[PDB]
Amino acid sequence: MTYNNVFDHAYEMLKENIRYDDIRDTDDLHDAIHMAADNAVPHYYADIFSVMASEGIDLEFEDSGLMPDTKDVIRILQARIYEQLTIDLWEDAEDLLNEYLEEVEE
Amino acid sequence: MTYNNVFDHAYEMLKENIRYDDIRDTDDLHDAIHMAADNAVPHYYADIFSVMASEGIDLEFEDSGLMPDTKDVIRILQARIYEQLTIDLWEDAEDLLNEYLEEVEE
Ligand SMILES: [Cs+]
Ligand SMILES: [Cs+]
Ligand SMILES: [Cs+]
Ligand SMILES: [Cs+]
Ligand SMILES: [Cs+]
Ligand SMILES: [Cs+]
């Protein structure tokens, strides 16, 4: 299981969420991006470790506020996947909102 | 342009997506089904109206969560095509996964 496979599942969810709620502006994207991330983080420890081993994600947090102060190592790793997803989905936000708007024409 | 012509294009895409990623289980089909649907929805208003006029699709949604709360009528119609595609492709999921698995023999 790789970070690229997890990111593809999150990107597809956000695409769906955009259509289901007719989202047109980045200022209304926060919750859709975070649900997509939540729905894409792996659940099994083994998949979480495999994702951390693959291309596209490092161990350091960008914002330490999204890092839990906890002794549970697996939660720290899950929180890091969750954070990278949200960052990468935000970089595709404008592109995705344009593709949605542009998919019909009279 | 008819719903049957749109569905044929989506069915063929999902068939391709199954081969390209060696998909073997329905629990791994979600994203392939939704991409196929997305790629098959018509873009021109006229084709969207012609599809709604043809055999195989009604105006009511099965899950209202897939219906956007919006004043844009054309988006509501597109969302209904998208939903019917996903429903009909899910009814063919097992059949398609069996045809893929069964296409080779030693
Ligand atoms: Cs890595
Ligand atoms: Cs914290
Ligand atoms: Cs991008
Ligand atoms: Cs009809
Ligand atoms: Cs909705
Ligand atoms: Cs069927």
Can you give keywords for this protein?
Four Helix Bundle (Hemerythrin (Met), subunit A); binds cesium ion; mainly alpha; 0% strand; elongated; homodimer; 106 residues; 5 helices
Element order of chain A: H for helix, E for strand: HHHHH
In terms of quaternary structure, what is this?
homodimer
Largest sheet of chain A: none
Helical residue percent of chain A? 55-70%
Taking all Cα atoms into account, the compactness measure Rg of chain A is 15 Å
Class by alpha and beta content of chain A: mainly alpha
**What is the CATH homologous superfamily assignment of chain A?**
DNA mimic ocr
PDB class: gene regulation
Keywords: all helical, gene regulation
Assembly: dimeric
Entry title: Structure of Ocr from Bacteriophage T7
